Structures are given as structure tokens and as C-alpha cells.
Write a protein that binds this ligand. Structure first.
Ligand SMILES: CCCCCCCCO[C@@H]1O[C@H](CO)[C@@H](O)[C@H](O)[C@H]1O
Ligand SMILES: CCCCCCCCO[C@@H]1O[C@H](CO)[C@@H](O)[C@H](O)[C@H]1O
Ligand SMILES: CCCCCCCCO[C@@H]1O[C@H](CO)[C@@H](O)[C@H](O)[C@H]1O
Ligand SMILES: CCCCCCCCO[C@@H]1O[C@H](CO)[C@@H](O)[C@H](O)[C@H]1O
Ligand code: NA
Ligand code: NA
Length: 501
């Protein structure tokens, strides 16, 4: 079995796994939408009660599985619980990361496309000071890029350039993964993560120097870091915080598990896992949280920044922020650095959520690494055409896989590992070879708190918010639901072919 060559490489690979578009696009929107500081107390608590414990669990299961030649959950789940149902629930460890990849890589290609056009200057005056005169040209620049529908039809007509940039983006993803763990993912991580950190820090400093009559970047930080306990009784804020923690740490994706399956059997995962987890949180709340919010707050104020955030998941990062930069000397180049930052962030994550299906084809169907990557890329490239042309197919998959799916799977893997497999032997697996030991308090959190917190969260979620979306959507949501259900059954069938091999 291939293994990471260095501890540093492993941590940066796993840090590049987590540090992605979630840190710089999702977290700002989630935080701004929920009162900044009002959002971070749940966020901090969710990290300590969900994020950290599940991080260790996923490392442990991956390492455990890798030791026996299996880095994906269909097999690992069966190793932890020899029941045919374990293999079927294990399929979600392939389905979630594949479905998330189908639209993640596309949004990743936007950041590359934008970056190219901002670098070359093919982008949309301060003499005009009315705001909408500055934001509309960037709204239209994005809407024309991805082809937002103008008429009654729910169809997207993405640019030719966007389509081509998508092809290039997958070619880049394949270029890395086709070289393996050590010489591929690990080598790119050691380059991308330094670059990512330097770009983010530079952007943070340029943003902190933004000042306008409606505020400063400082007002954005005090809005983000001013505690508030009015909404700590609000279910929506807790479910947003826990959803964000799952997504940003790549938990419930099966991706952490697959990476960890390439860690040597007796090599530490306790400190390593905690380091990658904490590195992502620093990149999230200090870098991600100090670019978009302070910029929008400084230029528009908090009320209008909160409105912008509520406007959409891409309004802030793809429209508002470049619009703000455009009012700065060299702002188009600053835009380039922002989207280049976003690209390396997403690319380091997209390669990680595609390797689960790659490792399944290598480990269970015994495909060569080369063919495993190409077939995986073809599956993602083809399926992405749903996301590229059907309006809001992106949202439907991000909901079932990237929001409901991750949480459901996170609770499933915990139950399999810590209840059925055995809390005491799971605890042994986590700490075996640990440089440090997991705080013994966390044994009880992982066994009783984390599952209760996720279980309670999923019912107040499933029987309150989702009946709304499950009843009055446009019929085209069924197209995406139909397709990703077919995907699940296709993967179930490969698991069936792998069991009988
Ligand atoms: C995988 C092949 C079948 C899927 C059909 C989608 C391929 C069509 O792709 C389309 O081709 C056009 C050519 O000008 C481009 O302008 C469009 O942006 C592109 O989306
Ligand atoms: C980074 C690689 C991008 C190569 C694809 C460029 C295709 C963009 O083609 C676009 O449409 C028309 C040409 O038919 C013209 O408006 C411009 O050449 C161009 O903006
Ligand atoms: C699934 C996404 C469909 C993408 C292409 O659907 C479009 O529909 C319109 C006719 O109603 C036309 O623009 C063309 O027939 C076709 O390009
Ligand atoms: C959940 C909150 C994180 C717990 C952090 C506690 O960390 C420490 O770990 C040690 C055991 O390993 C104990 O001896 C200490 O009392 C405890 O404070
Ligand atoms: Na992240
Ligand atoms: Na990443």
C-alpha cells in the first residue's frame, strides 16, 4: 500500500483536504447570515464536541482500514461491523464525496476562470459612487460566466470559456491524483499550502487597510467576534454552525478516512489529526473570516453586508469582494490573488474528495491507479453537466450530500465505530501510536455527547425545516434527485461486484 512519505506532507495534505472553498466562501456567508459573534459560540462548541472528536475517529478508521488494504468505508464499515448493511451504509462514504465533487470542482473552475480574467484585465468607475453602479457589472460578469437564466426556463448557458476552464480544472485535478499519494497529492500539498497561506495573509492585510465613510475593516471583526447569546437558543444557528464544521473539516465525506488509510499502521494520528483540524480552523476564522466580512462591512456597513451575505452563497466572494477591490489601486490584481487563493484552496480539497472513489477502484476492483483516476474523473466530468446546465441542481446536491449527507454519515460512522465495533477498542485504535493521547474526557463525548448532539440536531432539522423544501420546489429538483439516486445504486452495484470478485 502507498503511504505518505513525511509527517509534514501528511499534515499539509490533510490540511489542504480541509482548508478549501469552505473556509473562504462558505464560512463568511454562514457567519454573516447569523450575526457574526452570535454564530461563533455554537461554532466553537460544535468544533469541540463534533469536529475534533469525529476528526480523530475518521483518522482512526482510515488507518485501521488501510492496515488491511481498504481506505473506503464500504469495506472499513464491514471490517468494523461484519453485516451486509454495513457495506450499504458504507456506500455513502463513496456517494457523498462523489456528489460533492460533481459541483465542488465546477465552482473550483470558476475561481480559475475568474483568476485568469482578473489577471488579464478582462473584467468589468469610482466617479460614480452609487453602490449598484459598482456591483451590477460584477453581478453580470458572474451571471454571464455561469449562464444564470434570464427567462422563464430553468436552464443555464455557461460561457464557452467557463466550459473550457472546467475541462482544464479537471485536467489539473487528474494531473495531481494520477501521480498517487506520495508523489502526487503530498507533493502538491507542500507547495499549495504555503502559497495558500501567503496569499491569504497578504489579502488580509490589504483588506485591513480599507476604510470608507461607512466603516472600516475593524468594524467587520468586531461584528464577527462580538459574542451574542440571543441566538444561542436558536436551532437554526446551531444547525448552521454544525453543518459548517462538518463541511470545513471534510467530515462525513469519507475523504479524511481515505487519506488516513495511507498513514502507516503505528504512526500517530492524535496530534496529526488535531494539527490538521486546528490548521483549518485558523485558516477559517482568522484568514477566511478577516477578508470578506471586513471588506464588505467597511464599504457597505454591517446591515448591508449581512444583506449581501443573505443574498446568496456566491454573492460575497464572486461579486461583492471583486467589486470592492475594483475601487482599489491594483484591485483587479488583488481580485486575481483572491481567486487564485480560492483555486488552490478548492483544488487541494477537490483532489481529496475524489480520492475516495479512486481508492475504491484500486482497493476493491483492483484497478490500476491510472485507470482508477481516469474513470473517476470521467464520472465526475460527465455528471457535472447536470450542475453546469440545470439551474439549482448545484443546490440540490449540496443539500443532500454536502449538508444532510455529511451529518447523517458522521453519526453513522461514529455509531459503527464507537458503539457496534466497541467504544473501548475504538478508543484503543485512536490512541495507538499517538504522540499525545486523546483527553480522556473526549471518550465520553465521543460515546454519548457527540451522537446525542448530532441525533437531536438531525430531527429538529428533518421535522421542521426540510418538509418545507420537500413539498414546493420546482419539478427540476427531481432530475437531480433522480440522477444522484442512480449514482448511489451504481456505487452499490460496484460494491456488489467487488464483494464477489
Ligand atoms: C459528454 C458529451 C455529452 C454531453 C453534452 C454537453 C457538451 C456540450 O457542451 C457545450 O458545447 C458548446 C460548444 O460551443 C459550448 O459553448 C458550451 O458552453 C458547452 O456547455
Ligand atoms: C484559458 C483557455 C481559454 C481558451 C478558450 C477561449 C474561448 C473564448 O472565446 C470568446 O468568444 C469569442 C471567440 O469565439 C470572442 O468574444 C473571444 O475570442 C472570446 O471572449
Ligand atoms: C439539461 C439542460 C438543457 C441544456 C440545453 O437546453 C436548451 O433548451 C432550449 C430549448 O428550450 C435550447 O437552448 C436548446 O434546445 C438547448 O440548448
Ligand atoms: C472537551 C474539552 C477538551 C478537554 C481538554 C482537557 O485537557 C486536559 O487533558 C488531560 C487528560 O488527557 C487532563 O489531565 C486535564 O485535566 C485536562 O484539562
Ligand atoms: Na475547511
Ligand atoms: Na483544499
Amino acid at each position: 500500500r502507498e503511504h505518505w512519505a513525511t509527517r509534514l506532507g501528511l499534515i499539509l495534505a490533510m490540511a489542504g483536504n480541509a482548508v478549501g472553498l469552505g473556509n473562504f466562501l462558505r464560512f463568511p456567508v454562514q457567519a454573516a447570515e447569523n450575526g457574526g459573534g452570535a454564530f461563533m459560540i455554537p461554532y466553537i462548541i460544535a468544533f469541540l464536541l463534533v469536529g475534533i472528536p469525529l476528526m480523530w475517529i475518521e483518522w482512526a478508521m482510515g488507518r485501521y482500514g488501510g492496515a488491511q488494504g481498504h481506505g473506503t468505508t464500504p469495506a472499513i464499515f464491514y471490517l468494523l461491523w461484519r453485516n451486509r448493511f454495513a457495506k450499504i451504509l458504507g456506500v455513502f462514504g463513496l456517494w457523498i464525496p462523489l456528489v460533492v465533487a460533481i459541483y465542488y470542482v465546477y465552482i473550483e473552475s470558476w475561481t480559475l476562470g475568474f483568476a485568469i480574467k482578473f489577471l488579464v484585465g478582462l473584467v468589468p468607475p469610482p466617479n460614480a459612487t452609487d453602490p449598484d453602479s459598482i456591483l451590477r457589472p460584477f453581478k453580470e460578469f458572474l451571471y454571464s460566466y455561469i449562464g444564470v437564466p434570464k427567462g422563464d426556463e430553468p436552464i443555464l448557458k455557461p460561457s464557452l470559456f467557463a466550459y473550457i476552464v472546467f475541462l482544464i480544472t479537471m485536467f489539473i485535478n487528474v494531473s495531481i491524483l494520477i501521480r498517487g499519494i506520495s508523489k502526487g497529492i503530498e507533493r502538491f500539498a507542500k507547495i499549495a499550502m504555503p502559497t495558500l497561506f501567503i496569499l491569504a495573509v497578504f489579502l488580509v492585510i490589504r483588506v485591513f487597510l480599507l476604510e470608507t465613510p461607512n466603516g472600516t475593516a475593524a468594524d467587520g471583526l468586531n461584528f464577527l467576534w462580538t459574542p451574542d447569546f440571543e441566538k444561542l437558543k436558536d436551532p437554526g444557528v446551531w444547525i448552521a454552525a454544525v453543518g459548517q464544521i462538518f463541511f470545513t473539516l471534510s467530515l462525513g465525506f469519507g475523504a479524511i478516512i481515505t487519506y488516513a488509510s495511507y498513514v502507516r499502521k503505528d504512526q500517530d494520528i492524535v496530534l496529526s489529526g488535531l494539527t490538521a483540524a486546528t490548521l483549518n480552523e485558523k485558516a477559517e476564522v482568522i484568514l477566511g473570516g478577516s477578508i470578506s466580512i471586513p471588506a464588505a462591512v467597511a464599504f457597505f456597513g454591517v446591515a448591508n453586508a449581512v444583506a449581501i451575505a443573505k443574498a446568496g452563497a456566491f454573492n460575497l466572494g464572486f461579486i461583492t469582494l471583486p467589486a470592492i477591490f475594483s475601487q482599489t489601486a491594483g484591485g483587479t490584481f488583488l481580485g486575481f490573488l483572491w481567486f487564485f487563493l480560492l483555486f488552490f484552496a478548492g483544488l487541494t480539497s477537490s483532489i481529496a474528495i475524489m480520492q475516495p472513489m479512486i481508492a475504491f477502484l484500486e482497493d476493491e476492483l483492483k484497478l490500476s491507479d491510472k485507470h482508477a483516476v481516469l474513470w473517476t474523473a470521467a464520472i465526475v466530468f460527465f455528471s457535472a453537466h447536470l450542475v453546469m446546465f440545470l439551474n439549482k441542481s448545484l443546490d440540490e446536491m449540496d443539500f443532500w450530500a454536502g449538508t444532510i449527507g455529511v451529518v447523517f454519515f458522521g453519526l453513522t460512522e461514529l455509531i459503527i465505530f464507537f458503539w457496534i465495533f466497541g467504544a473501548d477498542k475504538a478508543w484503543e485504535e485512536i490512541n495507538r501510536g499517538g504522540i499525545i493521547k486523546v483527553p480522556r474526557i473526549y471518550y465520553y463525548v465521543m460515546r454519548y455527547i457527540t451522537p446525542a448532539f448530532l441525533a437531536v440536531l438531525l430531527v429538529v432539522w428533518a421535522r421542521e425545516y426540510i418538509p418545507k423544501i420537500m413539498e414546493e420546489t420546482h419539478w427540476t429538483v427531481w432530475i437531480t434527485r433522480f440522477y444522484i439516486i442512480g449514482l448511489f445504486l451504481f456505487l452499490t452495484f460496484l460494491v456488489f461486484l467487488a464483494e464477489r470478485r
